[PDB]
Structure 1
Amino acid sequence: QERRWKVAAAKKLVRTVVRHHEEKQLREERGKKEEQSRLRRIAASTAREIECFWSNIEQVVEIKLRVELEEKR
């Protein structure tokens, strides 16, 4: 029974060790991919603000041109 316990415990220990090794790889790859995704978001946030501003200036330019140049200046 001691022999059987020894081999079972050794098997469980190696299996847990390799799982510990693998989880670190999964953690690091998910972390760096999340970093790249946040780069993708923050880079496009500036473009979002810029195009919203461009829509705003286009809208106010159109409304200024309306009413016959706003009663002709």
Structure 2
Amino acid sequence: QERRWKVAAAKKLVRTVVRHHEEKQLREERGKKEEQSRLRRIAASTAR
């Protein structure tokens, strides 16, 4: 049972870490895209 718990816990923890990394990368990509769109909207507001 301890081996089972440790395998399952290692699986869950490593997959949560992988999730952390993927969410982090998606957050940086989203931040770059949002900054681009924010500058575009400022340009739109001034042109408007």
Instruction: Give the shorter-chain TM-score range.
Output: 0.7 to 0.9
Distance 1:46 1:10 in 2: 53
Whole-angstrom distance in 2 between the partners of 1:14 and 1:8: 10
Q: Alignment identity in percent? A: 100
Instruction: Please give the alpha-carbon distance, in whole angstroms, between the structure 1 residues aligned to 2:24 and 2:41.
Output: 25
Runs of 4+ that moved beyond 2 A: none
Q: CA deviation at 1:44?
A: 2.0
**Bigger mean CA offset, 38-47 vs 2-11:** 38-47
Q: Greater RCO between the two (CA within 8 Å, min separation 6)?
A: 1
Aligned counterparts of 1:42 and 1:24: Cα–Cα separation in 2: 27
What's the Cα RMSD here? 4.8
